[PDB]
Structures are given as C-alpha cells and as structure tokens.
Amino acid sequence: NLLVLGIGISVHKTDGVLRFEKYCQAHNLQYMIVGEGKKWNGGGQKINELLIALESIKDNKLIVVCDTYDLIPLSGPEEILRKYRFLTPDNKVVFSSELYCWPDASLVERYPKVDTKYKYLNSGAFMGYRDDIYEMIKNGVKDRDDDQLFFSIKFIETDKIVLDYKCELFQAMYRCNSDLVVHKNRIFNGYTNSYPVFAHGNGPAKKLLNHMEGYFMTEPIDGSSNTINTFKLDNEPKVFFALYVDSNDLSALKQFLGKVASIQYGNKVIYLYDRSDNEQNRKLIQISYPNYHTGVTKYVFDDFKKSDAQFYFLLEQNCIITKKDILHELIMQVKDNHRVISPMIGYEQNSTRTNFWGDIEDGYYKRSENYLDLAKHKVRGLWNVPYVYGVILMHESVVRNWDLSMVKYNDKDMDLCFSLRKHTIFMYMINNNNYGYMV
Amino acid sequence: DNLLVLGIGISVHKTDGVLRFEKYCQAHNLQYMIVGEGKKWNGGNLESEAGGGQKINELLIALESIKDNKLIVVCDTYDLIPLSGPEEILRKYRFLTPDNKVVFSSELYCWPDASLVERYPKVDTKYKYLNSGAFMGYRDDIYEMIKNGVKDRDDDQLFFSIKFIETDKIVLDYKCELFQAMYRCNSDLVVHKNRIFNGYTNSYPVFAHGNGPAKKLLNHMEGYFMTEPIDGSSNTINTFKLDNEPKVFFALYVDSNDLSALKQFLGKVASIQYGNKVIYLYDRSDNEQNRKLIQISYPNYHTGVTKYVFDDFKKSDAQFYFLLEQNCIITKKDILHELIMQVKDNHRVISPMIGYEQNSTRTNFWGDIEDGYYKRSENYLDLAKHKVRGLWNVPYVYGVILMHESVVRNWDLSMVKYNDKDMDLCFSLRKHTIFMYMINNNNYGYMV
Ligand SMILES: O=c1ccn([C@@H]2O[C@H](COP(=O)(O)OP(=O)(O)O)[C@@H](O)[C@H]2O)c(=O)[nH]1
Ligand SMILES: O=c1ccn([C@@H]2O[C@H](COP(=O)(O)OP(=O)(O)O)[C@@H](O)[C@H]2O)c(=O)[nH]1
Ligand SMILES: OC[C@H]1O[C@H](O[C@@H]2[C@@H](O)[C@H](O)[C@@H](CO)O[C@H]2O)[C@H](O)[C@@H](O)[C@@H]1O
Ligand SMILES: OC[C@H]1O[C@@H](O)[C@H](O)[C@@H](O)[C@@H]1O
Ligand SMILES: OC[C@H]1O[C@@H](O)[C@H](O)[C@@H](O)[C@@H]1O
Ligand SMILES: OC[C@H]1O[C@@H](O)[C@H](O)[C@@H](O)[C@@H]1O
Ligand SMILES: OC[C@H]1O[C@@H](O)[C@H](O)[C@@H](O)[C@@H]1O
Ligand SMILES: OC[C@H]1O[C@@H](O)[C@H](O)[C@@H](O)[C@H]1O
Ligand SMILES: OC[C@H]1O[C@@H](O)[C@H](O)[C@@H](O)[C@H]1O
Ligand SMILES: [Mn+2]
Ligand SMILES: [Mn+2]
C-alpha cells in the first residue's frame, strides 16, 4: 500500500541516511535506499538511479520519492495516504512546494498565480504511482543535469503534477522558521494550518532540522533512563584512547593523565600525542605510557586504523573527566545514526563556557536559541550540534571510512568538525550527567 | 509484574478531573479503580482549610475487598495525571526502596502543621516534606497504618506526616522519580518529549500533581501533552457534518434595546446549519414593544432576563446546551457539527475562539486570572494568533459555549461570587472541577 524510495547514493552510509532510516522504521514506513553502496557523481544522478530502482519495481505501486540526508518522516502510511487522496482525487504526482523559484528565475512568469507564498516546486520530495513517475523520467538525464529544473518544467508544461501548496505532505523548511513550531512530537505550520509529514531541511535549513531533532522522539522516552546513573557494559568493545597532550605545561599534563588513568575501562589501548618536541620528559612519561609520540600538531588516525579497536576516544589535556564509568555510559548511546558523541563539560569558574557550539555563522561560534538551556541542564539528552571539542567518542565506521583530515580553519578541533559536517556525519553532545570540567 | 492504581474520586457524579485521570491511566495501560464513586464528599474545603480524612476512610473500605498483598499506588485524581506506565513505575519503586517500604511524594512546604519543621529529617534538598496526594507500597503495609480509621474532617496529610516522622514505614521520594507536587516548582519543570522534566532533581516524574493552586500549571501543560500520537490530517478537510444530529438547545442571550444588533445576530444564528434544535431567546430588555414581531420568528421568547437560565433546558430532552451572546457573530456555518465531534471523555465544555472585529488578539477566553479578572498567560498570544491549534484548558470562556447535558443536568452552574453572569458561570465550573476548553482549530467568527 506504500513504498518510500529515499535517495542515498554513497559507498558508505552518512548519518543523514541512518537518521532517515530510523525515522522510517519508527513510523512503520516500508522503504528502500536508492543508490546505496554506489559512488556519487545538479542532482540528475538522482533521476538516473531512481529509473534503475523503478525498473525493478514491476507493479504499479504508490511511492514517495525523497531526499534522505536532510529529511525525516514524522508520521506513518495511514496519514500519508489520507492526505494523498485528498490532494489528488485523480491520482496525479504531488510535489513539495517552496518559497523560491530555482534554478531558472525566468519560470516565475510561467507558474500558476496563487495567493500563497509557497508558490514553486521543490524536487526533494514527491509522491505518486510508479508508472506515472517512470513515464516522466524513462529517457534518463545527464548526471550533472538539475533534477529540480527537470520537474519544474514538467509541472509548467504538462498536467501531470499537483503542488502541495498547504504543506500537508511535505515541508521545505528553508526561510520558513517563523511558520514552524515543534508541538506534540510534530512540526506545526501555522501559516498553512498543517502538520507536514516529511520535514525537509533543504539547503541551509539542515541547521533548523538538526536543531529540532533533539526535541523529537522515535519512541516514548524511558523516564527511568538515569534513575540509576551508574553504567557497566556486559561486553566491552575495544577502545583506542587518543590523548592530545603538551608536556610544555607539565602541571596540566600530570593532572590530566591522573584523571584519565582513573577512567574505569578494561578493554583499551592508550596512545599519547605530545605537541612538545622537547625529549626531556620522555623517560618519565614512557615508564607509564609506552605509546608516546612527540612533535604532533594534528589529530592522528593512522595508529587507530592499523589497530583492531572498535572506538576512537579523543581526549584533550584541558578536559578533566571525573565520571569514572563514562565510557560505559557513552557506548550505550552508540546505535543507529548516533556514532559521534561528546560529553558536555564547562569551565569550573564559568560553566556557561562549554565544549560545544549550538550554532555556527561563517564557520565561527554563534549562540543558539537553546544553548543556555543545554549548558544549565534545563533539558537533557542527545543534541545534534555543529561543533564539539576535547572529549569525543567515535565509532570505527566513521573513522575507518571517511576523510577526517580536511583543512579549512587550521585549528585541529575546528577542522575535525568541519570534516564531519561536510560528510553529513552528525556530532551529538550529551548532557545526561556531571562528566567533568575544562581548565 | 502487577500493579493496581487506586485513585480517590469521591463524588455522586464524575468531575472532569477524574475523567482526565482515567483517560491518562488508560493511555499508559495502567490498571486502576476509582475509590468512592457514587458517594458524597465530606472531607472539607481543601482550597482553604485542612481536611481530607474521608479519603483514608474510603481507602480503608476499599482495601477490605483487596484481600491479597498487592503492590498499589494511591493518589489524588482531581488535579493529577500519570505520564508513564507500569514498567517504569515498578523499576523506580524497586530502586527507591529495596526493602519494600511505602514511598510518599515530597513537596516544598510543611502543611498543615508548620511546627513539624523541627521534627522532620534534615536533608540538603528543598523537597523536604511529605505530600499525601500520591504514594505507593504494599496493601498490607498501607492497611496496617490506616486500619483504625480517622475523622472525615481530619487532615490526611498530617496523618501520614506523623507516621513518617514517628515510624520506619515510609520513605520520601526526594528526587521526584515517581511523584511531582508541582506547587511553586515552576522554575524546575519543563515539558519535553511528552513528559515533565525536573531539572533540579534530574528526573522525569511519573505522576504530575497540580497540588494546591498548581492546578493552573497542570491545566496549562495539559494542552501540550498527548495520550496518543496526533492525527496530522485532523483539519486537512475542514468541513464537518453529523448524519445523526443529537438534539441541541440554543440559549440566545439578547438585548432588544439594540434592535439592529439583535437582527444582525439572529441572521447569523439562523444560518448555523443544524436541524435537530430548539431555540430560546432570553432578552434583557423590559420593553414589551418588540414581542409580537420577534415571536413570529422565535416563539420561545422571554423578557427581563439578566442571568443565564437552565430550567427550560432541563425540562427538554436536549443532549447539549449551546449558549450564544448577541455580541458574538458566528460565520462558520458547520460549527456545531465541528464542536460536537470534540465532545468526549473529559472534554465536555467547549468554546470556539473569536476575537474582536477591530482587534483580533482580544478574544473570548482568558488564559489566566488574578483576583477574578483577566491576566495574560505565557501562551495567550500564541493561541490568539493561531501559532498552535487544538483544545486548551483555560479558566474563563465567554459568549459561545457548547455544554454536554451531563454537566448542565448534574451540577450547580448558578453559584455567585462576582455578581456577573459570564464570570460566575466560569467560577462555578472551576469550583466543580469541570474544565473549560477553548478551541482554535478554524476561523469561527468575531465579537462586536
Ligand atoms: O552524496 C550524495 C549527495 C546527495 N544525495 C542525495 O541528494 C539529496 C539532495 O541533496 P541535498 O539534500 O544536499 O540538497 P538540498 O535539498 O540542500 O538542495 C540528498 O538528501 C540525498 O538524498 C545522495 O544521495 N548522495
Ligand atoms: O469532592 C471531592 C474533593 C476531593 N476529592 C479527592 O481529594 C483530593 C485532594 O483534593 P485536591 O486534589 O482538590 O486538592 P489539593 O491536592 O490541592 O489538596 C482530590 O484530588 C480527590 O482525589 C474527592 O475525591 N472528592
Ligand atoms: O490537607 C490535605 C491535603 O494536603 C495536600 O494538598 C495541598 C498541599 O499540597 C498544599 O501545601 C496546601 C497549601 O497550599 O494545600 C493543600 O490542600 C495534598 O496534596 C492533598 O491530597 C491532601 O488531601
Ligand atoms: O592539544 C593539547 C593541549 O595543548 C596545550 O598547549 C593547550 O593549552 C591545551 O588546551 C591542549 O589540550
Ligand atoms: O524548536 C525546537 C525547540 O527549540 C528550542 O530552542 C526551544 O526552547 C523549544 O521550546 C523548542 O521546542
Ligand atoms: O447579554 C446580551 C447582550 O446585552 C447587550 O446589552 C450587550 O451589549 C451585548 O454584549 C450582550 O451580548
Ligand atoms: O509548558 C508547556 C508549554 O507552555 C507554553 O506556554 C510554551 O510556549 C511552550 O514552549 C511549553 O512547552
Ligand atoms: O575495577 C572495576 C572496573 O573494572 C573495569 O575494567 C571495568 O571496565 C568496569 O566496568 C569496572 O568493573
Ligand atoms: O462581553 C464579554 C467579553 O468581553 C470582551 O471584551 C472580552 O474580550 C471577552 O473575553 C469577554 O469577557
Ligand atoms: Mn535535501
Ligand atoms: Mn491534589
């Protein structure tokens, strides 16, 4: 009765596609990921891989076709089918609407005139019968052709497409901040008076969807999650501790190593990466920590990749961990699209200054609407944020499969986060407990 | 494993408070019984005095019929809802008391005897004192404490406070894991993921208790909670029609001293689409000169009326009472169909939100009240501008009100406090724990 075709063309899965899959599963939506396992080469490749997928669907199924990296469903098939039937009694293909006419601004005068601001087609989500969609795309396109232009022209030049002007099925979120609010585990659009099913953080609006993600749920919360706030795994995966130290500040080095040594975890290997090139501390340090390296000024992944460890645990010398069972606690949260997790810590004398950024502007720190709420623990959980620092747990499927060594901002911590953002790998801050402090 | 919730609901007729409790219990698969159903309350005026001993007396009676040693929750129902189910409750109980003691709610204040302050255990937290509106333990242990009974007008909270201080039978839920007494805890509490989160204790309390004046906080939060995922297509089609119309009694409050206003209003009322109706006109005018003309169109016409009247309705076979004031202009013709479709469970009094024609953010509901008059609530403007839509539990509604017969037939809606018909109707409903729901789902009309 319904199949969702999510476009997810990549050799390795992004967190965007993993999040999409989790929300489909939560809402009982049957899906397939179009292009899974293939190399990405705009957006016409979406149409070409779609055509392949449709060729293998024999019968005339009702389908949704949608983006995955920046999009989640918030309801299930029953609501979707009610809305489709209302929107198009004669079974045409329904496309998302949006605020802007692109990529060809000259189509403005060829679109139907409407009272609403939601005037134009967005190709990132649509719904209709397999045969009808197949008929429109059956000749293929160029990989580097624009899929949005392709369908905009079809809308203007044929009677095959209807636009979702009232945002019943689909929401293109960009520049619609003032219309949207989180209410009862949904987005409500007060301009249209609707609860859109598919939330599309199109273009820069990935930041708004990622912001809202921490307020949605895929299942009711277990309110006893932290009633007992001690954690111990049944089976411990191997964790590679990557310690970024500076023996030029010997007092800080000693304080930090003492705290790391008190983290309770059996199945570990510890590497020290010292930015100093002065060899005078090697004898003393190596007695306790043989895997000691000097003159290191970048984050290092080669030792990890050559190991059999399952997790990379990055620790900076100015981050003091006091919660001894923290690795057990953190590993219990690594599932689905949660693969990079950073415990929230603040300066002792200044607890509003923490190791995460809630927002970013032109690459630098911006105060988000919920930053102070998070930093003061007014709400707790996992939070999709643009930058995390100094205490970072990463699953091997991130470190082994993606380039984390891209350069833009020169500072090692800013370039790690830049790399993750570029790959659609999400950083989750966690503030469930008192974990430590920065010095 | 097993759990039974014993909600205290001593009344001949059910309040909306108990109906809301029952709905949330059912939503969370909590097995429950209502203690005291069918009996008259004789426990005192708890809004302004000590009391509540009758709750212990009716509990005792109820426990006599639970022969085996079941794990039970006992709780208030008029101002209290559960937000999770039995699995979470049992995990928390077992963590809080490995030796199976009776767990009581905590609260901020030492009530009703302020001199017990020096007798309580000293603790770091502000949640220092016992609240008897929710507790959990084994039937035999609770039975043992209450087996002799008390006076109906005795204070139940005092009774258990003394037991906590003088025995080892009770422990307090200091961290608000099972229970939250919400009064004066506003800054601690936030709505998040269909729960209350307490940032002071770092907990998600199961039972949300609007104790004392905090009924206003719980009623406010109610509009943001759900008992089931919402149906996002609820207003995709915004026309409504009942094929089998229940009988509706239209009670029109009119003033023929402004004849042009009266005619404009009646022309809108006559375009409300509804067949199975009876229409009464209650005119505040004492001038009889318009009787002959009006009665041609509306034979059920009465003059000199300055109060809301329910006796004609009670003599009828109508199932709903639809109150309409002359300055309320209804433009949505299918409105009664729309409103009747929302009447279920604890939703029995429903008022469509309309604004003044020249000033749409001044509406026919009040979000808060101070010494009886309007006060601006935290979400009033959001509601007035349709930033969020639905049903909202508010202290005052005016001018367009649909009431189920189970309210009108069974409760005194004619109590006097302000000597003002609209203010005194809402006062009466608040007194009885009958809730007023504003609804803002569609464009309904306007006030003049
Ligand atoms: O490596 C890639 C890049 C993009 N896409 C798909 O193309 C969609 C459109 O790109 P994006 O959503 O970034 O564009 P926007 O909606 O911001 O214009 C993404 O969600 C994916 O579904 C993909 O499958 N693989
Ligand atoms: O007519 C009444 C009045 C009170 N109660 C019960 O007594 C409790 C305590 O009164 P309330 O909760 O109104 O007050 P508070 O917790 O503020 O004392 C109610 O919740 C009911 O469970 C009752 O059963 N019938
Ligand atoms: O008096 C018995 C009554 O006590 C509790 O209710 C209120 C209490 O929490 C508050 O501190 C005082 C003063 O505002 O008012 C009390 O009515 C308890 O919640 C209730 O169940 C109990 O019967
Ligand atoms: O990168 C290792 C360390 O280098 C030092 O020079 C800085 O003061 C620390 O904040 C940092 O943790
Ligand atoms: O929009 C998602 C959330 O954003 C936060 O910044 C606000 O404080 C919340 O009230 C809101 O639910
Ligand atoms: O109560 C009936 C009517 O009386 C008139 O005098 C008032 O101006 C109206 O606002 C009211 O609806
Ligand atoms: O506390 C319940 C609700 O109250 C409203 O007044 C706020 O605007 C919401 O953000 C909040 O969730
Ligand atoms: O010393 C006790 C600790 O030993 C660690 O190896 C283990 O990871 C912890 O869970 C705890 O058992
Ligand atoms: O006529 C009574 C009405 O008066 C209006 O001025 C007010 O906004 C309404 O809430 C209601 O009180
Ligand atoms: Mn997209
Ligand atoms: Mn109570």
UniProtKB/Swiss-Prot annotation, chain B:
Superkingdom assignment: Viruses
Molecular-function annotations in GO: procollagen-lysine 5-dioxygenase activity
Pfam families to which the protein is assigned, alphabetical: GT_PLOD (PF25342)
PANTHER family: PROCOLLAGEN-LYSINE,2-OXOGLUTARATE 5-DIOXYGENASE, PROCOLLAGEN-LYSINE,2-OXOGLUTARATE 5-DIOXYGENASE/GLYCOSYLTRANSFERASE 25 FAMILY MEMBER
Name this protein carries in UniProt: Uncharacterized protein R699
Organism per entry: Acanthamoeba polyphaga mimivirus
